[PDB]
Amino acid sequence: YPTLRSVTLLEAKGKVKDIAISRERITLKDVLQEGTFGRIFHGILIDEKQAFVKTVKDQASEIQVTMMLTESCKLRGLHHRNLLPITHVCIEEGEKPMVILPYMNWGNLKLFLRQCKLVEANNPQAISQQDLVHMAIQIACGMSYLARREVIHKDLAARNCVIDDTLQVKITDNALSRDLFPMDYHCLENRPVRWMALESLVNNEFSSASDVWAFGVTLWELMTLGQTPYVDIDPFEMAAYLKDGYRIAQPINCPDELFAVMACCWALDPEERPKFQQLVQCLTEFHAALGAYV
Numbered sequence: 001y002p003t004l005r006s007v008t009l010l011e012a013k014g015k016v017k018d019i020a021i022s023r024e025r026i027t028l029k030d031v032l033q034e035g036t037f038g039r040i041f042h043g044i045l046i047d048e049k050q051a052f053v054k055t056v057k058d059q060a061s062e063i064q065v066t067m068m069l070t071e072s073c074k075l076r077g078l079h080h081r082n083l084l085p086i087t088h089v090c091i092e093e094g095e096k097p098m099v100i101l102p103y104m105n106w107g108n109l110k111l112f113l114r115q116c117k118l119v120e121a122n123n124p125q126a127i128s129q130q131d132l133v134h135m136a137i138q139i140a141c142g143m144s145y146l147a148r149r150e151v152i153h154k155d156l157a158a159r160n161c162v163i164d165d166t167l168q169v170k171i172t173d174n175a176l177s178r179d180l181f182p183m184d185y186h187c188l189e190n191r192p193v194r195w196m197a198l199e200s201l202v203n204n205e206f207s208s209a210s211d212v213w214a215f216g217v218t219l220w221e222l223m224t225l226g227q228t229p230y231v232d233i234d235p236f237e238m239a240a241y242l243k244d245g246y247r248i249a250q251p252i253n254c255p256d257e258l259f260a261v262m263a264c265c266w267a268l269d270p271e272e273r274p275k276f277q278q279l280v281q282c283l284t285e286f287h288a289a290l291g292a293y294v
């Protein structure tokens with residue numbers, strides 16, 4: 001007869017033990033982001049390579065440190081130029097754990113978009129839709145690699161991407177994202193309500209198709225240079241507003257046809273939304289088109 005139906009810190013350290021190295025090989029330099037308990041450094045790894053380093057403050061509880069480690073593994077063992085998996089950890093007993101990743105020197109994609117948005121204020125015809133779509137293509141190309149391997153990201157958003165000075169984008173794990181971008185998660189459990197498909201909101205169901213819904217919102221983030229979506233909508237009414245057939249407004253200066261792509265991702269029936277592979281194909285076409293037709 002059956003029964004109807006919790007990770008510990010040591011268990012979480014256990015899952016990363018095979019890429020553990022000694023702290024002494026790590027030199028932290030500047031703090032790039034910081035929240036209530038979490039903190040992202042730019043650091044140096046001696047064989048020197050440059051790295052992101054995720055870590056915690058002294059105020060961090062065992063529960064938060066544990067979820068940092070477990071969430072850091074979302075992308076372990078995957079190898080794709082548009083994915084940023086972790087490469088090492090430091091988990092010595094009695095010390096604050098650190099997660100180590102390859103560095104992307106223009107940092108968080110969302111914070112980067114907003115810095116550009118400040119440029120656009122006094123240079124209005126300065127932003128390149130082709131450049132933005134180039135970012136969208138890469139994101140879809142990494143998601144396609146995840147979706148084909150039945151890996152569900154569940155938190156695709158611009159705040160979980162990074163970009164370097166060659167305009168290459170990589171999707172990251174979401175460790176510390178709730179502590180670093182608290183305004184984007186709501187209790188309605190602390191969830192990215194504004195990026196979530198209606199069926200994830202209502203039934204707690206996640207799939208590549210709900211990943212595709214969040215890609216649609218992430219494409220909207222790109223075309224608005226990082227606008228917080230659904231600012232005028234109370235998170236408790238997000239599901240009701242979606243059921244009544246309402247969607248976010250088309251970004252200014254964004255082609256009708258590209259907005260149609262992101263609307264396609266927000267179909268209520270999950271099986272009507274496109275696949276990431278079709279998205280890669282289509283946005284690729286769009287990239288050439290946005291070069292020739294300004």
